[PDB]
Design a protein around this ligand. Structure first.
Ligand SMILES: [Mg+2]
Ligand SMILES: [Mg+2]
Ligand SMILES: [Mg+2]
Ligand SMILES: [Mg+2]
Ligand SMILES: [Mg+2]
Ligand SMILES: [Mg+2]
Ligand SMILES: [Mg+2]
Ligand SMILES: [Mg+2]
Ligand SMILES: [Mg+2]
Ligand SMILES: [Mg+2]
Ligand SMILES: [Mg+2]
Ligand SMILES: [Mg+2]
Ligand SMILES: [Mg+2]
Ligand SMILES: [Mg+2]
Ligand SMILES: [Mg+2]
Ligand SMILES: [Mg+2]
Ligand SMILES: [Mg+2]
Ligand SMILES: [Mg+2]
Ligand SMILES: [Mg+2]
Ligand SMILES: [Mg+2]
Ligand SMILES: [Mg+2]
Ligand SMILES: [Mg+2]
Ligand SMILES: [Mg+2]
Ligand SMILES: [Mg+2]
Ligand SMILES: [Mg+2]
Ligand SMILES: [Mg+2]
Ligand SMILES: [Mg+2]
Ligand SMILES: [Mg+2]
Ligand SMILES: [Mg+2]
Ligand SMILES: [Mg+2]
Ligand SMILES: [Mg+2]
Ligand SMILES: [Mg+2]
Ligand SMILES: [Mg+2]
Ligand SMILES: [Mg+2]
Ligand SMILES: [Mg+2]
Ligand SMILES: [Mg+2]
Ligand SMILES: [Mg+2]
Ligand SMILES: [Mg+2]
Ligand SMILES: [Mg+2]
Ligand SMILES: [Mg+2]
Ligand SMILES: [Mg+2]
Ligand SMILES: [Mg+2]
Ligand SMILES: [Mg+2]
Ligand SMILES: [Mg+2]
Ligand SMILES: [Mg+2]
Ligand SMILES: [Mg+2]
Ligand SMILES: [Mg+2]
Ligand SMILES: [Mg+2]
Ligand SMILES: [Mg+2]
Ligand SMILES: [Mg+2]
Ligand SMILES: [Mg+2]
Ligand SMILES: [Mg+2]
Ligand SMILES: [Mg+2]
Lengths: 114, 23, 54, 100, 146, 124
RNA sequence: GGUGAAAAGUACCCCGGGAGGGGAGUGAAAGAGUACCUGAAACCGUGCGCUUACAAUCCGUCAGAGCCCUCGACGUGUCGUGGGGUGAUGGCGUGCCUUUUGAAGAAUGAGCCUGCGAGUCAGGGACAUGUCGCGAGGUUAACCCGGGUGGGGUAGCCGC
RNA sequence: AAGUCCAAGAGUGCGGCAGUGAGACGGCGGGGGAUAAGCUCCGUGCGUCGAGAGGGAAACAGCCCAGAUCGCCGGCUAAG
RNA sequence: GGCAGCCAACGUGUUGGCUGGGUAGGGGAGCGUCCUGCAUCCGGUGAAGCCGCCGAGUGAUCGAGUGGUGGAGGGUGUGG
């Protein structure tokens, strides 16, 4: 085991499968490397996930009191959240359904040795 | 009439003894 | 046309797999005496201060 | 040496000490049964003649009574509505062979 | 219970079969027999545990009757009208080896294990082979009387 | 007296789903498709439990034939001679003899050949 | 429709524009946080174990190598009356239901899960058969008296 | 006159509860048709399928063998 | 070697002999759910429900065997 800090972001207005597509870029990396990768990656879902990673780092800053530079994003994933249902009217009186999906991004970072 | 002849004749095998459904 | 059968999990996950992103390749630059990482495309523009390193 | 015992309508290759799961035998555990032989191999010579194969028996001891694996049967025929469920566990005895 | 081979139980022997003036079907049937391992008391249909077979003098195979001109080998290229036929005749001097091996492939099982089994067959049209390092013992086409 | 039929309904569901573990696809996830697969599974188990006794006899015969022909005798003549000699060992243990110790198999082939007619093709 | 016994409904600190969280506290519990009792399945991830890129698979079943876990024994890795997981490979193998002479059928129906959805009830009805009471008899209907399911009620009805 | 007779699970009579009343192919006897049809209509103490699993006929309801109470890592056979 | 249906023998629970494919359909005997009369038992030292483990029964199914979660009601007998 290694000392760990957690951060959760729930009900983020981003599809889970669109959050995972940038989560898969940064899994198992140092926090600073992950933050850089997210900051230059051209998909909008980076904005939530990046924040979540940073939030976790701060917890290890301020609640475990451990070294900034040893942090690695050990576990990160995106669960589905509640879906809102809407209607788009279509041709000849049809009415199709629209899903406004959300996500829960969870990150656990560990202070591994160098 | 190849299909009919060739189906109808496989009744004359040893294991069928000169008989078979649908002749 | 219309899908004849519901498609199986193996075959669904086979081409959901191709929908991925690639991480940009970063290089190091020195701005205001401290080191930052930027794409090699934006290297010059960082070296003369036209990209906002937060 | 090793023999081939006859029991339960089946033949089992046996050497002293081997444990064999055979069909049910009427013998309380601890009792010693004696079983006929279909063949004996001693080193390099075998006993195949019928009269002198009848001269030797294998003596074994009953260790316990066992239930075989649970077998589940579900007979089924399509479009007729016919199902039939049942199960079977076979009764067995464990024999620790002592002498040949 | 019944014997099944473990990991290091299979041992492989190298047989060289001379094909000079032998019937193609007889040679191929025997080669398939001792290529599949049907001559071993440790046979088990699950395991590929046969032997290596070299066929020497695959040129000199004997084909009885009148099959050197009226027996065909058909291949289809998958394209409409993509069927070509070569007699046993043409196939014996264009490149002869496959003739012999063709027969053997038709008497091995047509499953994945048959693909693994094929690799032990080495057919050579000449009277000599490069595998002298494995000491291939000559094999005679024998029949057991009854 | 209204009943909520869910306590009783779920029991067979859990039984069938627990039996359907390892099934590839949705035959291990959905009670209906798993039940359809269980029908085939138990019929196939009956079929193969019956035919296993023939598959194993096939295997024993094949091994015995190979060992016999190594000893230069045909399988059919071998068992004909063993029947003539009164040695009454079944094909299972005869296959264990063929594999484990071939010397006893050789001796038993000797007995079978010694107890066999001077002409197997004689009109008798 | 359902937080908790009681709002005691999270002071203060930290990341974040907020939303959301992490410490700290409240509480018996926060796997009770005003998205709140229990929290199943479908569906969606993440981690580990075995397997899989020369192979024609109603997707199983029977035999089965190798690997992984676990329980015993002797001992110190190899057997055992063993147990699990996964499965290279080999044999066999044409979904379910309706309706049909006959459907794997290229006939119908069914995307999936969870909840729901079809021989019931009334009547001195009719016929038959069990069971019980009384028996050449058997029984009351309306009704009357009983805080009751008890007791009276011969009109009729069936047998003769 | 016997046989079967700890069974055919047989006849016949009365009653309660039925389903069925679209059959198929094969052997033998025939009508219709062109002595055609995997056609159609009858007869048959004829069979199988229907409502039948298992083995053979490559596959193959109706053909040949044989009627599945369950288990066995025993043996003998049938058609082939 | 295990079960069951019909029948027989001694006799009063055994043994023996025959038999046990099956749709429409007929008959018999049962599993699980809920509500209740009466009787007993369990439960904040943790009921139900759910998720497992290890097992059991000829079948529906069972687990007054066990853990995890859970937080207030349940089991069994004999009738309705
Ligand atoms: Mg960004
Ligand atoms: Mg409009
Ligand atoms: Mg729509
Ligand atoms: Mg013509
Ligand atoms: Mg005809
Ligand atoms: Mg059918
Ligand atoms: Mg039908
Ligand atoms: Mg599996
Ligand atoms: Mg506290
Ligand atoms: Mg609690
Ligand atoms: Mg909710
Ligand atoms: Mg809740
Ligand atoms: Mg491969
Ligand atoms: Mg094929
Ligand atoms: Mg397979
Ligand atoms: Mg197959
Ligand atoms: Mg219709
Ligand atoms: Mg129909
Ligand atoms: Mg029709
Ligand atoms: Mg269909
Ligand atoms: Mg289709
Ligand atoms: Mg229709
Ligand atoms: Mg449809
Ligand atoms: Mg409804
Ligand atoms: Mg009524
Ligand atoms: Mg008679
Ligand atoms: Mg009878
Ligand atoms: Mg009758
Ligand atoms: Mg009519
Ligand atoms: Mg009619
Ligand atoms: Mg008719
Ligand atoms: Mg017709
Ligand atoms: Mg006629
Ligand atoms: Mg006519
Ligand atoms: Mg006709
Ligand atoms: Mg007729
Ligand atoms: Mg019908
Ligand atoms: Mg059949
Ligand atoms: Mg019939
Ligand atoms: Mg006949
Ligand atoms: Mg025989
Ligand atoms: Mg014959
Ligand atoms: Mg009996
Ligand atoms: Mg029956
Ligand atoms: Mg029968
Ligand atoms: Mg209950
Ligand atoms: Mg009660
Ligand atoms: Mg109490
Ligand atoms: Mg408490
Ligand atoms: Mg209740
Ligand atoms: Mg507890
Ligand atoms: Mg509990
Ligand atoms: Mg009741």
């Amino acid at each position: 085991e290694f000392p760990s800090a957690t951060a959760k972001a729930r009900y983020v207005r981003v599809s889970a499968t669109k959050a995972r597509r940038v989560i898969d870029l940064v899994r198992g990396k140092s926090v600073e490397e992950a933050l850089d990768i997210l900051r230059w990656a051209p998909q909008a879902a980076s904005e939530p996930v990046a924040k979540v990673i940073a939030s976790a780092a701060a917890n290890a800053q301020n609640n475990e009191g451990l070294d900034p530079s040893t942090l690695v994003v050990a576990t990160v994933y995106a669960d589905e959240g509640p879906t809102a249902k809407r209607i788009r009217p279509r041709a000849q009186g049809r009415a199709f359904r629209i899903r406004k999906r959300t996500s829960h991004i969870t990150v656990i970072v560990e202070s591994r040795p160098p | 009439a190849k299909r009919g002849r060739k189906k109808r004749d496989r009744k004359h095998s040893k294991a069928n003894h000169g008989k078979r459904p649908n002749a | 046309a219309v899908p004849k059968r519901r498609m199986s999990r193996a075959n669904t996950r086979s081409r959901r797999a191709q929908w991925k992103a690639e991480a940009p390749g970063l290089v190091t630059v020195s701005v205001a005496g401290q080191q930052r990482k930027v794409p090699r495309r934006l290297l010059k523009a960082a070296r003369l201060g036209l990209v906002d390193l937060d | 040496t090793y023999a081939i015992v006859k029991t339960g309508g089946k033949q089992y290759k046996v050497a002293a000490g081997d444990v064999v799961k055979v069909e049910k035998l009427d013998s309380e555990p601890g009792a010693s049964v004696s079983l006929p032989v279909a063949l004996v191999v001693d080193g390099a010579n075998v006993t195949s003649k019928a009269d002198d194969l009848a001269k030797v028996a294998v003596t074994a001891e009953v260790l316990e009574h066992t239930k075989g694996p649970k077998i589940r049967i579900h007979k089924f025929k399509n479009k007729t509505g016919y199902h039939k469920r049942q199960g079977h566990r076979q009764q067995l005895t464990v024999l620790k062979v002592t002498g040949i | 219970p019944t014997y099944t081979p473990k990991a290091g139980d299979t041992t492989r022997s190298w047989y060289v079969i001379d094909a000079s003036d032998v019937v193609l079907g007889r040679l191929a049937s025997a080669a398939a027999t001792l290529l599949r391992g049907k001559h071993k008391p440790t046979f088990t249909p699950n395991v590929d545990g046969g032997d290596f077979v070299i066929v020497i003098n695959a040129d000199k195979i004997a084909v009885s009757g009148d099959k050197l001109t009226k027996k065909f080998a058909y291949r289809h290229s998958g394209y409409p009208g993509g069927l070509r036929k070569r007699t046993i005749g043409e196939l014996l001097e264009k490149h002869p080896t496959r003739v012999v091996e063709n027969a053997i492939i038709g008497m091995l099982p047509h499953n994945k294990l048959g693909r693994q089994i094929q690799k032990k067959l080495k057919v050579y049209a000449g009277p000599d082979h490069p595998h002298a390092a494995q000491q291939p013992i000559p094999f005679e086409i024998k029949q057991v009387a009854q | 007296a209204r009943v909520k039929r869910a306590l009783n309904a779920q029991k067979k569901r859990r039984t069938v789903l627990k039996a359907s573990k390892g099934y590839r696809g949705q035959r291990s996830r959905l009670y209906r498709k798993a039940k359809e697969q269980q029908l085939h599974s138990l019929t196939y188990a009956y079929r193969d439990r019956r035919a296993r006794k023939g598959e194993f006899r096939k295997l024993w015969i094949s091994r015995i034939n190979a060992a016999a022909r190594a000893n230069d005798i045909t399988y059919n003549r071998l068992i004909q001679g063993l029947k003539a000699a009164g040695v009454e060992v079944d094909r299972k243990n005869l296959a264990e003899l063929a594999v484990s110790d071939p010397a006893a198999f050789t001796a038993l082939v000797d007995v079978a050949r010694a107890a066999l007619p001077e002409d197997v093709n004689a009109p008798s």
